[PDB]
Amino acid sequence: GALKYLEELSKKKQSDVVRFLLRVRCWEYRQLNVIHRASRPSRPDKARRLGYKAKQGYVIYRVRVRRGGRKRPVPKGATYGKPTNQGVNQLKYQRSLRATAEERVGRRCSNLRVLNSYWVNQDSTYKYYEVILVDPNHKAIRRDPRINWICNPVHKHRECRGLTSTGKKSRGLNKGHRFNKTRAGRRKTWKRHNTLSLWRYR
Amino acid sequence: GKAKKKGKSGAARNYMTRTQAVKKLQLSLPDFRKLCIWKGIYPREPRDRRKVNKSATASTTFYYTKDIQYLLHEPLLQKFREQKALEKKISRALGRGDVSNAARLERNANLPEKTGKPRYTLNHIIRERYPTFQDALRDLDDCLSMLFLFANLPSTTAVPAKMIARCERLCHEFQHYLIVTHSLRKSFLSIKGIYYQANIQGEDILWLVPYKFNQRIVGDVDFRIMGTFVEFYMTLLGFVNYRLYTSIGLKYPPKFDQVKDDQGAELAAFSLEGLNDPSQLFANFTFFLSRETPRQPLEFILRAFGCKRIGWDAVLGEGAFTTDESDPRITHQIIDRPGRYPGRIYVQPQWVWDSINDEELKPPELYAPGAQLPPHLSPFVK
Amino acid sequence: NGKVKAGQLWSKNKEELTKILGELKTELSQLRIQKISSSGAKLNKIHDLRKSIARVLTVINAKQRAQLRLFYKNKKYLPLDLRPKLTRALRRRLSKEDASRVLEKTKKRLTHFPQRKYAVKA
Amino acid sequence: KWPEYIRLQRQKKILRMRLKVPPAIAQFQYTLDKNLAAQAFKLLNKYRPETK
Amino acid sequence: LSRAPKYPRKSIPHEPRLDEHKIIIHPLNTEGALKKIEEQNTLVFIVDVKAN
RNA sequence: AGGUUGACCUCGGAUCAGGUAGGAGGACCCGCUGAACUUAAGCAUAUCAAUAAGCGGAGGAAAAGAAACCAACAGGGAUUGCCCUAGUAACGGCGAGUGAAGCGGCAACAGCUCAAAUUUGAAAGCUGGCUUCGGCCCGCGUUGUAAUUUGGAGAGGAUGCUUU
RNA sequence: UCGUGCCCCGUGUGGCGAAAGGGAAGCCGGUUAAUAUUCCGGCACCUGGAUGUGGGUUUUGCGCGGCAACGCAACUGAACGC
């Protein structure tokens, strides 16, 4: 199997061969559109371990997103309330650039379902991602029990609700004491802890 | 109401040029010309060609817009596209080295060089062009002239040799129908060829057949569009022959002997089987054809006018009633050479034509060998 | 007169149904003018003609749609109006066979270890 | 003025020539010649996989 | 290529929306129409608003 | 014929064959974004509040979920919810205030699928088209579609019984 | 016709936006309880299309006259330009 070798080669991102490939691919993806279709995944081992198959109904979309922080759309970058002791140049978006990439790719292809996505390259201005999408309407997808769970309507726009891997990472859906506030849902847990319960025989 | 603009109505809408027609149908020029010939799209002439196209010259060809609209719905366009895609697949298989796949895909091409039939089927086009069998019988003049001309031509890329053999087969089947029904009426020998006139279901059918020599194909003709005409006419003649044989209650197609055809039977290789008075003018005679005499027209005329016993020289082919010239049963002998067996009538070939044209037996002393023949008159001009 | 019942209409085929529809429309056309010119016991007749036109159109449509369904009984693709309506979500829902498809390892495990029928002694 | 895809592929080839290529990728530019490639294919054409 | 569908999107060709019985509703019985009948050889009709 | 004839790769066109998306509803649900009045004597930490407004996305429920868990015991054993833990551990100008979790009882219980292996004595897999419904084609796919394995193991052996 | 192609050209890019801007063409007389450059009568015009007749031109093939300004019922004119 070659994919084991591709895995250990992708681990070594500071090597000369990987740096050369990353540089030339950064230039090529910068000359391409912000969202475009990849004919085949440029990281086949990563795509295969994230769930991509060489089957009709699996597509790959490459996308670049502008990296850095978040800026609040206020006039002249100023707020007219109480002082904040900070500027809009240090506001941090609570989701990931990978999640932004997934939503923009899903809006470009609203007929598909986002399965997952992966980092492929980056520079100072952009981060580059490759998003795996599955066609829920294709017969080969619908006849395959390993994937036709995504044809059900409960998985419409998983990237818009945080049901992808980066969505779970940003929502903090992990077990244990470090994730007390968020493991069952932060707002649901807050509602449960702030609900006043009155029984009949109290 | 709103004022009309110039050039948006009238002859501009009524006509289009050949270039505009080709671009509208999205065809190549050979396919467009082939489709126009097969569907009967004829050139037209506007009163003022500048009102149709400002760049038109005297050599510009015009067609009807409604005719091109009718051509837009012809199912042969998809046949053309399918054949183009199939040829691309064959080229791909040959380039990859899949010779078995290339042969299997070439079997779907239905090439004329392999089948003897036209590459595309024109069965619906025949019914579209001829609403009635009377119209088919009226166009049989051109059909028979074209097919009897092309039955004696060398093989080319436009008309392959198997296609030429199919043309000869159809002509022989039509001749056998005429012989069995005694429909042949008049014949003439001009300086150009042999004219035949028959009467099929009340329609007078006149056609010209070349003498059996080497026919010259000159560069002044368009041989490929002539081959398209030949394809259309063989598609017509097959259906015409089937209808005639079914009407007279015979099995179509007739039984054909490949071995006899190889030995040279020609007309004699056909066995007509049942399904499931000028006609008897040569009924009691036995004819012998010497080799210098035209065997195919002589046999056709004698068998159509009632001769049941025709032998000839051995090199003329298989199927003679007798082969030896010393047979005492022979009554008449056709010779054309400048030692005569007794009790036999030796005549030149003009005696047969004159006798069938005047419907009575001529005196043989005028058609005796070496004598000056009487003038051969035209049976069509009164 | 002017009342055409569906029991007689369900036995006809298309041409005399078209003839009846034309005659009813013609009678309605002249009697609209008769309505604007005079009145009486007459307006019941034009109401009956309107309902008869509706009945004839309904019968013609039903018979011709039945013929189209018979024609499209054994074809893969049907016209959209002849396809079942249901709801949009019901049409987008997975089919029964595709929802009931299982993997081969699951099939083997269910073949050899299904849910058994058992009881426990008290 | 070529289309963007033609310009992109030509500039990609040009950039791969202009930059310094590490040996692990640069070794793939050394290939068999015509004669040895033809002999290898002549041997391997007798062992093609089974068709349908 | 032009469209060659495998099924018609509409099984029923629609009946003509505006036939003659829908175009002509009733004539006008007013005195203007009655005067125009003899003064002009002109008949006046109330017709559908979509008819030209 | 080689200045030709092709095989691929990438990128396009078509009222091409077949499909899908949008909007509504939004009480409940999943996220993003995000106040101030109020309470702190006033007031830039704080509180109101990780709330209101705004934006995106589902369903009859959603979400979560079969441990990179809790624990420190003689150990429990996916998720959710109720009672209790507990106004407790803990955080907090000049203090107003804020505030969980393990265990325990109960309601309900259900477990699994891939990537990383060579089928290599035979891509065994699949979309679509035409069908006489037997199949036959155009293709996808070896830059990997089936079977097998998923840590509870498994693979290879040995071995003798059971199962459909 | 190696029949399944070749040649020419560059200028870009769609829509909305004026009952007072630009713009093809209708006047008079009469007529109703109420409309009229809209109806009725008479007399016209514009735009577009098809195809005739007369007349014109042509055997010096695509008119003639006036020194000229130009005139006369006609009196060939594609691309590309002014």
User: Which residue is listed with tokens 């292809």?
Assistant: A109
Distance CA B50, CA A120 (A): 64
Query: Quick check: C79 contacting E, CB < 8 Å?
Result: yes
* Exposure of B172 in the CB half-sphere (CA atoms within 13 A): 23
In chain C, which ranges are E strands?
Answer: none
Residue of B111, B113, B104, B27 whose CA lies nearest to B63: B27
- How far, in Å, CA of C3 to CA of C51, rounded? 8
Identify the experimental approach.
cryo-EM
Q: E44: which chain C residues are within 8 Å (Cβ-Cβ)?
A: none
Task: Kindly determine whether residue E10 and residue C80, on different chains, have CB atoms separated by under 8 Å.
Answer: yes
AA letter at B153: L
Among B68, B71, B69, which Cα is nearest to B17's?
A: B68
Between CA B291 and CA B297, with CA B293 as vertex, the angle to 5 degrees is: 120
Cα–Cα separations (whole angstroms), residue A145 to A150, A153, B274, B277, C115: 10, 16, 66, 87, 22
Report the nucleotide nearest the CA of residue B23, measured to C1'. Answer: G5
Can chain B be said to touch chain C, i.e. do they have 3 or more Cβ pairs within 8 angstroms? no
Asked if A152 is an interface residue toward chain C (Cβ–Cβ < 8 A), one would say yes
Q: Are the beta carbons of A28 and D8 separated by less than 8 Å?
A: yes
- Which nucleotides of chain G have an atom under 7 angstroms from any protein CB? 1, 3-5, 24-25, 33-34, 39-40, 46-52, 78-79
Spell out the long-range contacts of B19-22 with Cβ–Cβ below 8 A and sequence spacing 24 or more: B20/B53, B21/B63, B21/B68, B21/B71
Interface of C with A in 58-117 (CB under 8 A): 89, 92-95, 98, 101-103
Contact residues for B82 (Cβ-Cβ < 8 A; gap 6+): none
Contacts of B265 (CB under 8 A, 6+ apart): B257, B317, B318, B319
**Quick one: DSSP state of residue E5?**
-
- Closest approach of A58 to chain D, Cα-based (Å): 24
Distance CA A62, CA A126 (A): 12
Instruction: Give the residue among A41, A32, A42 at the shortest CA–CA distance from D7.
Output: A32
Q: Which residue is nearest to nucleotide F116 (CA to C1')?
A: A4
Nearest CA to C60 among C92, C98, C14? C14
Cβ pair A16:D22 closer than 8 A:
yes
Burial class of E33 by CB neighbour count within 10 A (0 to 12, 13 to 18, 19+): middle
At A144 the three-state DSSP class reads coil
Declared resolution, Å: 2.5
From the number of C-beta atoms within 10 Å of its C-beta (0-12, 13-18, 19+), residue B163 rates as buried
Residue with tokens 């018609």: E8
What is the number of other CB atoms lying within 10 angstroms of the CB of residue B329?
Answer: 10
Cα–Cα distance measured from residue B32 to residue B23, given in angstroms and rounded to the nearest whole number: 10
Contact E11 C32 (CB under 8 A): no
Minimum CA–CA partner of C106 in chain A: A145
The closest nt to A154, taking CA to C1', is F58
The answer to whether B163 touches B112, Cβ cutoff 8 Å, is: yes
Tell me whether residue B73 is exposed, middle or buried, using C-beta atoms within 10 angstroms of its C-beta: 0 to 12, 13 to 18, 19 or more.
exposed
Residue among C89, C92, C94 minimizing CB distance to A148 = C94
The SS3 of residue D51 is coil
Q: Are B68 and B22 in contact (CB under 8 A)?
A: no
Nucleic strand F under 7 Å from the C-beta of A75: no
Q: Please report, rounded to whole angstroms, the spatial distance between the CA atom of protein residue E39 and the C1' atom of nucleotide G43.
A: 22
Q: How many CA atoms lie within 13 A of A143 on its CB side?
A: 6
Cβ–Cβ below 8 Å for D19 and A31: no
Angstrom distances, CA of residue C6 to CA of B52, B256, C66, E12: 58, 65, 16, 22
- Contacts by A64-71, CB closer than 8 A, 24 or more apart: A64/A29, A64/A30, A64/A34, A64/A101, A64/A126, A64/A127, A64/A128, A64/A129, A65/A97, A65/A100, A65/A101, A65/A104, A65/A126, A65/A127, A65/A129, A66/A125, A66/A126, A67/A97, A67/A122, A67/A124, A67/A125, A67/A126, A67/A127, A69/A93
Minimum CA–C1' distance nucleotide for E36: G39
The answer to whether the annotation marks A84 as part of a ligand binding site is yes
Contact between B175 and B164 under an 8 Å Cβ cutoff? The reply is: no
Spell out the SS3 assignment of chain B: CCCCCCCCCCHHHHEEEHHHHHHHHCCCHHHHHHHHHHHCCCCECCCCHHHCCCCCCCCCCEEEHHHHHHHCCCCHHHHHHHHHHHHHHHHHHHHHCCHHHHHHHHHCCCCHHHHCCCCCCCHHHHHHHCCCHHHHHHHHHHHHHHHHHHCCCCCCCCCCHHHHHHHHHHHHHHHHHHHHHCCEEEEEECCCCEEEEEEECCEEEEEEECCCCCCCCCCCCCHHHHHHHHHHHHHHHHHHHHHHHHHCCECCCCEECHHHHHHCCHHHHEECCECCCHHHCCCCCEEEECCCCCHHHHHHHHHHCCCCEEEECHHHCCCCCCCCCCCCCCCEEECCCCCCCCCCEEECCHHHHHHHHHCCCCCCCCCCCCCCCCCCCCCCCC
Whether residue C94 and residue A143 make contact (CB cut-off 8 A), yes or no, is no
Judged by C1' against the alpha carbon of A156, the nearest nucleotide is F58
> Are residues B336 and B290 in contact, defined by beta-carbon separation less than 8 angstroms?
yes
At E3, which amino acid appears?
R
Other beta carbons within 10 angstroms of residue A122's beta carbon come to 16
Q: What is the dihedral of CA B113, B116, B119, B124, to 10 degrees?
A: 180
Q: For residue B79, what are the CA distances in angstroms to B26, B76, B216?
A: 14, 5, 34
Q: Report angle CA D37, D42, D43 to the nearest 5 degrees.
A: 100
